[PDB]
């Protein structure tokens, strides 16, 4: 009768819900906001900090900080506030009644997992918990056991090749470029047009502009020429106060950084090269299955035209006689969560729960011996 | 292990097919093998034997209409079965109408058929439904809330306030005769709903102003969809028809009761705990509590440390209240975990927490002060901590001097000669195993001007770019030359005090003349340098040798503490003299020698300088500063004059005298702590020297010839206006430049022990006599004058609060 | 319950009364007269203008003369309210952007001179917003000597965006004398100013379009109204009815370089962070007797709508009791049972001094 | 013997002069004045404009605007007036006879660099020109090829890390806070005492109070407590009217906005965090040399105690084993121009110039 909770704590968004549901019931930004001013109206329900959607709604008098920066947790105190908001405000459940399935990035340091386990058992008193690799859950969600997942969220971008349900660690590639870097680059290139987005609240406005009007061009140098040749690629966006700004070439120059990291000063390779290098680090006998099963995950893979451009670039790197296939599930924003909902719903998963009695007799080191 | 895989033949041939049904593998009946439903997902295991080699192929089949929970469960269970069979099976993904040949060969009987339909998906479909409702706020003191059964004007009256909750759009409708108290409470309730959800916009509307021009077009269109304004006039109730605010509040207060669901001694008992008013402390974390608001709502508060039987029976008993009292279906029952209390739940409690009796992204370093231990200085340093040379200095070098804002190559005969007033660029090229590497040194003279230092830096970059950027650029300030730089000149370097041009041009006297003095000194066998110094007797030092050129003859003066390496370079320099050198020993000084140096005056001569390192302990210099946030002291080995900074204070250990060098731009707290640290320095020295060794303070510019002697050459042109210590003494005076000696020991003295001054003196802002504590100027008054000014004795003054003392001081001008 | 006092130290009128009442029980002018060659405060001071020199201690919202202010409060406690201040906690109001030293001096006077058991200081614009039940909105407090634009978002202050305009009520009655004189009449006497002030409060209004309403007065006599002077003579006020309040929008009518109350409201909102401007546009709350002109709410909606983007909803809230909305807000706050922990007690002042008003109050 | 001109296009002060000189010959405000009431007075027509100190004298009848308000040129029509005042009025020279070295702000857009070079060649017909980054010139003035420059002027503060002559654009920080904001903040906290500084002529004396009596406290919390306990930090200032005012904690509260930008309502980080973040966005190999060469530049780095404070703040964020050295050149108010005068005097500049013939392509 115990219904299990599934919580995908991302660097930008947290996707939570119940095991057995076809989608996360709670999706909100993982931000903590604190006021920049002093309260003048006494007894009107002011708070010292704001979490999630409330922080986003009142962001005009707030400084927004992400507890997870570049995929690494930097404020465990604010991370507890996010988790407290998830259990008590969004899902509105008692955490001591529900087993919780959490997710982690590949090759996660064991210090981050042992503290996550300690917080779940000592602060929220969950009956049991389990940590699952994010990329692996996305492959299962697409009905696959073999493939190379491109997980690009807000903090980091991973390339995780998986063969028969097991990831190949020696080939997992990591790129420190994701959504937040794309947002900040859009803020930068929007100044050359006269606009000024500086504050952490204004950054959220740019992020919405990025999600609404940005797209990946099939040929970048060609669209840069068509941009000046006309105005057919210019769009308008209404700011919250009613001001209308117009953007043009910035629509595709922003996500182009995914393929040309030199736009933001990174000397690393693009997402197209990191996948090829990841596929080329596996056995030659399994590479054909990988090339034919590129599964995209995360919100940063939601740009219009990123799948077509991805297939174009990989075909130029791979042998001409190789069949390339980019898989772009319609709900890949929540593919990690979906796989968790399926995994936590299996009858054979009750054996995998790290229980509280196991934690009290072994310590936080028990989490590693169950998730290898 | 899944029980459906238990009976799988291990190592023997088989052919088994399962179908995914509600996240579980269910075996397919054997007579139906080959019929796959289009809306389902399957798993097929084919263990076949082939010439003694067991072939194990695992396929999971996905119908074209199979749901995501089934495709995922098929993938997951395929892996479980593969691991359960030791991992030897090979996995295959099979999609309908595009299966592999191996999968199609299993059904060569043309038995492969796609059936319509399939078992239901195990997923629950999240809908995100909106509970649109019409709430009323009515009362006299604490207006209460009630949900109306339907959304129409018939449920509204013109004397109360109504909320139209439409999810992310909230309308606060204020009746024409609503009380101001009800208006304020309804906005709190509305703001509470919005904040519990995180999104929403409150739209305040007044009775009568339900127009598109007053609300906005899109805002009125939504309002008219749920409350048409044309039907208002007919159905809207009046103020009196809405009831009395007093009764509505009176009844709903008594309507509230608190139950307790506790499991004590294994017995579950439901007990009425209290009634209105209710307070948060009534809720205990060790049990469950039911908040009964009747038809308006039932709430189940579950404590953090409650019991599983308490958690279950609390809701079952709460769910029973609905049927027993036969409440309407609108009456709901909500579970409230401890810590997830909503605004509506809190509104049922008159007392909850307390009011808020009173963040910058910029963070300022908060480092608390610490008293520096002087014993750590006696613990001896790590002089050879970092050492590294890329070669032996035998590589190729080209030397350029900054002349006329450009580069002029020095002749090979002048290599080793530098002018302290110019800047140089030396391009060093060394090879290791045939691979050429380049190092670009730019050496900046102590008196080189900005134009010459800039050209040296800019043309250093240009040569580096001429080599493709492969060279390492090293900035070298005079007197602080690195070990590899000295090895390029075979460890012997000659620094003539002079220069050339500078921002246009001037008297660029080319050469040291015929009467110049050289100071030859080295701290090792590799950094032996010969630097030009003024031809004055004070320039001499007993630890070093000197070479005196003159038109009559060249002389070499060997101090008592000079090393053999210092004398060797002095002889080699004097070997170029066509006159021939006449070596001299300290003490054996002929009068003709002093006459060429202006006459014998006091020079750098101390017990530490005459002695060799074999007997005396070498000199040590410590830089003291609080610029790092805390007062610290660090040693400087191979210390020279350039290592002195005016912003800090330094301590020099010379065995018989410990000097405290006071920089002009140093903070006062740095000076005072440096002296206190110098007293703690020798009080902890276990070497057995005199506990009362002289500890004098020396001021920047007024340095005696024995203080400058422990350093290398000294340039009076920096802080002494070019005057020697004797010339400074003549113009200023002995008691004008005296080295005051440090002594021990004011604050925390009693009122009677403080020096006394008249009120006419302390009340002045500037021009105050010294020794007056500006922070406690009232203590500098007498017992009698204090009573006349402050109207009270000092004893009663100090008993008054600190805020009153500061205000009294400001009133009397003694702040 | 200990009955609390509420005193709105206005620029031209002191609104004082008891906490819980629906209206201030004492409304007298903030003027104190001195011999010129003694003390007289309030309306009695204006009956002896020829003998005394009248000064405004709070001319433009901020208290300047403290010795004259101690007599305003003395006239408030013992003459108007007829109470003993040492037996009543007193809530006091302050102008926006009041210096911290100014608030500490108020605390010192209340505790050391009047020996009150407890006191509290609230911003005037915050109390007006509280009266309407809001925590968000930009207040237009237009009184006698000063008008402020005070934006507030979710109970937080935006002091960087507070606008102050030293053109208000008394500037308008003086301009009404100047234009009524230049049509034939003569209003120069100090007693005639009280008559002009009555003409202003009863016959003046704000025109939706000034140039059009001026053209109507030039081709018709429909806008002309009549007024009875105390001596019986009836006069006719014409375009002066709407030319007097127009100064709030065209300060050049009285030789001021500042912008009108519509531009100061818009410029104030545009100094706030972009994510809070939408709620301010839809919550323009008006307070003060100078916002009582008929038509000023409709004209402010037109003027802000022209300056703001078309996609923004402009709403002007004009509460019917906005002349005393500051005091009404204070009367509700001081009466809340959850506020008795916010008072600054005398025992707390004795330990920390007047700077405690910056800790408990804000 | 063709002499070259060096012009520093500053946000509040234009520094112009001749190459090979120790200091700029002319330094005037970057302000252009246009008539308020056109046609009423002689010399007050539509096309009449005034630039520099004369626009400050005729401030009552002029409008006055900043062309390079935030380091970036925005008004080009008023910019041509500034350069015209520089050539013909201040330097008193013909621009068609002297190659011109101009300075650009860090991260100056390519379009601005192209409109600068067009105006010099077409409107002024200069023989050759070149633009340079202001931070690199400051570094050359300190005899260094590598360092992280902190340039704080009138409208903008920039952190620019440089290694072996070339800067790292991806690590450049920008802070829209400088002396003009500090001058405005001093007027605010002075009126909080009741001294009433609001007019422009009063802002002139407030700017002088800032440059003569303000300092950076080593420990802001301790000095705030010292200023509340005794008048030992208070100093007096005599206004032109003979009235004498006294300032206390305002002396160090005003420059503290450089380290706590929240004092004026800014969410950005202090100059210590932007310097730390600028070094941390560089390669780790060169971070050791950057911490040892923090070269300060600009008039707003002249407050006494700012070097000690920058060290105290950076040493708390850097690793404990780092050697942190702050360089404070005595002539850092003109380090940009001095570096330009050095570069424009290098004979190897004749190949780096952009001749007019090359531009006519
Ligand atoms: N339609 C879209 N186009 C481009 N980027 C998007 C889109 N929607 C969301 N994103 C970006 O994806 C990120 C969220 O991805 P998510 O998978 O939630 O990452 P995380 O793993 O950090 O939770 C955000 O940074 C957002 O800016
Ligand atoms: N009905 C009205 N029409 C126009 N002006 C009015 C009206 N009632 C009062 N006033 C003006 O309002 C001013 C008083 O407003 P108030 O808010 O009390 O000012 P303060 O708060 O600055 O003392 C007076 O100058 C008076 O002329
Ligand atoms: N001694 C000083 N102390 C404090 N501030 C100063 C001093 N000298 C100049 N300033 C400030 O420096 C600012 C401008 O200097 P500058 O570097 O020329 O700016 P920019 O180059 O950006 O035009 C002015 O705002 C001025 O207030
Ligand atoms: Ca199915
Ligand atoms: Ca296998
Ligand atoms: Ca009612
Ligand atoms: Ca219990
Ligand atoms: Ca020289
Ligand atoms: Ca190099
Ligand atoms: Ca020696
Ligand atoms: Ca120092
Ligand atoms: Cl999906
Ligand atoms: Mg994610
Ligand atoms: Mg008022
Ligand atoms: Mg500058």
Author numbering:
A (entry chain f): 4 to 375
B (entry chain v): 2 to 359, 365 to 751, 755 to 824
C (entry chain g): 4 to 40, 51 to 375
D (entry chain p): 4 to 364
From the article:
We successfully crystallized a complex of P. sul villin bound to three subunits of adenosine 5′-diphosphate (ADP)-Mg2+-actin (VA3). The resulting structure was refined against 2.7-Å-resolution data and is characterized by R factors of 19.6 (work) and 22.6 (free). The asymmetric unit contains two tetrameric complexes, each of which reveals a stable three–actin subunit nucleus, with villin playing a critical role in its stabilization. Specifically, V1 binds to the barbed-end actin (A3), and the V1V2 linker extends up this subunit; this facilitates V2V3 domain interactions at the intersection with the longitudinally associated actin subunit (A1), which represents the pointed end of the actin nucleus. The V3V4 linker encircles the actin nucleus, enabling V4 to interact with the laterally associated subunit (A2). The HP linker facilitates binding of the HP domain at the junction between A1 and A2. Within this villin-stabilized actin nucleus, the V2V3 domains reinforce the interactions of actins A1 and A3, while the V3V4 linker and HP domain stabilize the interactions of A2 with both A1 and A3. Villin associates with eight calcium ions: one type II ion in each of the six V domains and one type I ion apiece in the V1/A3 and V4/A2 interfaces. Within the actin trimer, the two longitudinally associated subunits adopt barbed and pointed-end subunit conformations, while the lateral protomer exhibits a monomeric conformation. This provides the first view of an actin-filament nucleus, revealing that the transition into the filamentous form is stimulated and stabilized by the interactions with the pointed-end subunits.
Villin is an actin filament nucleating, severing, capping and bundling protein; however, the structural basis for villin’s functions and the characteristics of the actin polymerization nucleus remain poorly understood. Villin is a member of the calcium-regulated gelsolin family of actin filament severing and capping proteins, a class of proteins found in Asgard archaea and nearly all eukaryotes. Eukaryotic G domains are often associated with a ~65-residue C-terminal α-helical headpiece (HP) domain, indicating that this architecture was likely present in the last eukaryotic common ancestor. In vitro, villin can nucleate actin polymerization and bundle filaments.
